[PDB]
Amino acid sequence: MSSLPVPYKLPVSLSVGSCVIIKGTPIHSFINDPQLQVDFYTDMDEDSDIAFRFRVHFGNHVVMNRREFGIWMLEETTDYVPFEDGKQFELCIYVHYNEYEIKVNGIRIYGFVHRIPPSFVKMVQVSRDISLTSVCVCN
Amino acid sequence: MSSLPVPYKLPVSLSVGSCVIIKGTPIHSFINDPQLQVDFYTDMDEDSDIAFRFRVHFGNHVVMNRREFGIWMLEETTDYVPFEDGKQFELCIYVHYNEYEIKVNGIRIYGFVHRIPPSFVKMVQVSRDISLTSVCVCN
């Protein structure tokens, strides 16, 4: 059972130096191809532009993109997905001056460069095949 | 030296179940009568109404109040202020359905009952005689 509802839409204010810390557990085993998605939305409205979408295909790869004027830009990917089958994970997204740094269980896996300033992000949505224990926003 | 600037004005969205976790250190010894203040503001504008003001007189007492239509209401106080002279403290404010619960270094010291809904709080300001290490907002 999830501590928070999923999809989880969290109003936020982000600045350089912020960290979003998401703790949860996949609800399906990896042979069932579960996913996790995190969106940095510019408004509560889910059709608003997205500064950074992060979609993990557990045991497979992560696909990242951004949506500008309603148009998806060029996808970025990495095969580095150090999540453990069936276990709680800790996903940290650090807002640096040039990029979002993504850490999985303390392991840096990617840096997604800002194409709009991160202070334009007003909502973080956590969605798909996870039970959500906690979400924190720290400075 | 402070990790964050003081006064620290943090835009927030709070709901029942939120926790504001403030870590920092008094910048004066207790014989010099330092203070710490935390405000739950309804807007970024510091003349907006205040759902909950928390002002610690270290080694002495805490005074709490709220400001409604620009008018300060009746002060509430407790003498329970378990902060240590010269040390880092952890101040947690939990948003429950009926009250803000205030914890100092894990110790519950007070419950300040809501007179407006906590979701009306849009800014948290941390101010006065502290160096601020971190501020987190968790759900």
Numbering used by the authors:
A (entry chain A), B (entry chain A): 1 to 139
Q: Anything the authors wrote about it?
A:
Galectin-13 (Gal-13, a.k.a. placental protein 13 or PP13) was first isolated from human placenta, and its gene has been mapped to chromosome 19q13.1, which is in close proximity to the galectin-4, -7, -10 and 1412 genes. As with all other galectins, Gal-13 adopts the typical “jelly-roll” fold formed by sandwiching two anti-parallel β-sheets that consist of six (S1-S6) and five (F1-F5) β-strands and a short α-helix connecting strands S2 and F5.
The wild-type lectin was crystallized in a solution containing PEG 4000. This difference suggests that wild type Gal-13 should not be able to bind galactose, which likely explains why we could not find lactose bound to Gal-13 in crystals exposed even to 50 mM lactose. Even with 50 mM lactose in the crystallization buffer, our Gal-13 structure lacks any electron density that is expected for a bound lactose molecule and only shows water molecules in the ligand binding site. However, our research shows that galactose, maltose, xylose, arabinose, glucose, mannose, lactose, fructose, sucrose, and cellulose do not inhibit Gal-13-mediated agglutination. Moreover, our biochemical results indicate that Gal-13 may not bind carbohydrates, a proposal that is consistent with previous work demonstrating that Gal-13 purified from human term placenta contains no carbohydrate at all.
